[model samples]
Target chain A: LADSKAVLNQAVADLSVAHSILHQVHWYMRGRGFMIWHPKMDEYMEEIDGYLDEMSERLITLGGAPFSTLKEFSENSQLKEVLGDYNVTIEEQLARVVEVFRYLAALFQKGFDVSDEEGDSVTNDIFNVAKASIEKHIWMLQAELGQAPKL
Target chain B: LADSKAVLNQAVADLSVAHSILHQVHWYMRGRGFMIWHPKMDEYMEEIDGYLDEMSERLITLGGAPFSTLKEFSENSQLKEVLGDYNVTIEEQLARVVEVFRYLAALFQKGFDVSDEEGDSVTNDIFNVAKASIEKHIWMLQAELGQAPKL
Candidate 1:
């Protein structure tokens, strides 16, 4: 429970950070399929919101609290803040998003590992699903960049 | 189990329909803050994908199969198909979206009611959360049209 709770809290903060950053990318990405890929960033953020809610609910069930404020997310997220001109090309935005998705997949893997160690199969399944979704996003984002995704 | 399976199948079809239509709207909506509302449509679609996945998983648990093809969704969905003219005003798009969201809210309510009758509290909670999220979407979409959402 302790390990699962820590992972959940970490997930909450990373989710918040991902949500904000994805919205920024959604607003800025521009290209031939500007509309196509732009809204995709929104989809990623919305998916993260679902993951956050699920993790937070599980955390509460395990007698722990999830991060609730921007400050908390800012201080704790494994992902970094984007600080620069919001007018980057779609390629640049996609590259940046790939970084975030990679981080999220690794982060969710941590949750899966900890949950498995603690014999918390339910929480482990949650992280299992999260990792799969994050990897799917990474694959699509990478494809858009004309690159092959590894694993 | 049979009744719950039916509800889950219906949910999958509707979610698929919603996903396709929202992508069209995301591609075609035009007006002030079109970018804003456009990405929002993506968020809504992504959310339905989550609901679809959850219901599909539950259906499998109940020894039932979920609709897996676009043809299956088209044949099973209660919602109407999105038609031509990607050139519509954002107002028209919003109104159309509101209608879809209203349909979804009612559908989720049906899930809640049936789950309650079937003694499936877990499914009932899923529908409960789905309703809350759909209503939030309805509220914001309505607010965009200078209207108010009821419940």
Candidate 2:
């Protein structure tokens, strides 16, 4: 039982940090945005950032990392930095959200699979919550998408 | 019972067409928005137009007017026309969403009250559905919102 809890705890912390970075970086990106061609991208990015923040905070309370600090988050996260040229268009924003959602969904699925092996229902619960939210975001974006025309 | 259903049906039909017109005009305004500032406004407009179409279809399925024609929709709707001369901005999009949701909620609530008083439960049911949708949209927007920064 101790082993299972420890494992679940580790998974939660990892996810908490991951979620925070997703929001933090997303927020930073929103703050910069493309500026010229697609200002609404700014709002979209902000929304993503806020969602990340809300989700991460909840995860943190559940024994997740939920830490602040760019250096620590960058080191742990799979998300790339969106610095330099800020010419990202609207399609780019949609594509990025889709990509992130897909990536995170896979990550949680792996976590769920591991949880199953270890009998960690707690980890499974966390994964279910994270996966559902990301899926919802992905589904909304997918509803409007038409075969990634620009990419 | 049939008479009651007819009254209910007409009441719902009125509410549905009202909601459809609001969504359509929002999209139409959005489509005209692309050139002034953000090219991404086109994508946003596309999404809005899709919602308009979807909502109209849903109304028709419920035995309501589809509000198919712009002129007819506008004539029946309380929403005012967008001035052709106005240039678009990102903030304006957000503001418009808030406005549409507010109007939709009010109209649906009004319909429910009126229909219920008339013993038209079917119409009241349709209005309730619309009111719920508007609330969900409003909540999602709020959840995803970051500090407006300059808004």
Candidate 3:
């Protein structure tokens, strides 16, 4: 139970970082005039809400410390960036997306390494979610950019 | 081999889009802020490029066309959006990310169903790269909002 609690706490740490960063994107896109914008953006926002609630609840149930406060999140979140004003250019928005993606990827890689070291399957499974999604998003973001990319 | 060609083509198309978009990010971030804003950004950009190159070669080897041209991609892509003039906030950016994820998820879900019907493992595998990612992001985006979202 202790091991599982620790693992779950670690998993939530990574996931919570993701939640904060994703919020930045959600708020920042306010008023951007992309004709192809997600018409379902509103519903998707609800989805984020659901998971955060569920994850937070699970963390409490597991008897692990939930990093819920903004101050705590800022300190613990691997993806934290000192965000500025809203209404940045579309290009800037894309760069931030790249930053958050890279951050989550590194965090998952860390989690995977740690989980393997601990021989912890439960935590490893959580890490798997972060790992695969980040890698795939790296691909998706590139695909979104739509042309000759320079490394 | 013929079926495998579809996999290559899909990767090429997907990576082609990614490669182009990454380049745009490279240019956008250059000199605008700290040269190594995220520090590890340069390395990740390389990763994207490598994945793209490998995917491109495999694509051509499969005797199918890769949509290397912007015109071709613009036409085929259901997720591509026109740029807005102003910048965005992290929240706003997330909204767009959610929007893009939904679009791709729906497209890939359709592809998944068709491929399943045809027993096309190769195509299913290819589409799965995107299908699964889209679904995960849908979950991730939801986690971001934290509240029962309004928009």
Best by TM-score: 1
Q: Candidate 1 or 2, higher TM-score?
A: 1
- Docking quality (DockQ) of candidate 2: 0.05
Could you give the candidate ranking by TM-score, starting with the highest?
Answer: 1, 3, 2
The CA lDDT of each predicted structure is 0.83, 0.51, 0.52
* DockQ list for all candidates: 0.02, 0.05, 0.03
Residues B17-122 of candidate 3 have per-residue lDDT tens digits of 5444434444444333324432333443465455456545434433345767777665655446455423544454445545644654565556566655654333
Candidate maximizing lDDT:
1
Residues B26-62 of candidate 1 have per-residue lDDT tens digits of 8877788787887788788889889989999988888
Chain B TM-score by candidate, in order shown: 0.95, 0.53, 0.58
What is the C-alpha lDDT profile of model 2 across A9-124, one tens digit per residue? 33334444444444443444432223432443344445545545544654565565553555655655655655433355445555666676676677666766766777767657
- TM-score (chain A only) for the predictions, listed in order: 0.95, 0.58, 0.67
Count residue pairs with overlapping backbones in model 2. 1
Candidate 3 lDDT over residue span A1-151, tens digit each: 4555554455456556666555666566644544433332333345434544554565577567777666676666555565755767655655666666666556555655565566755555555554444454455455566622211
Model 1, position B120: C-alpha lDDT score: 86
Docking class of 1: incorrect
lDDT of 1 at B72: 95
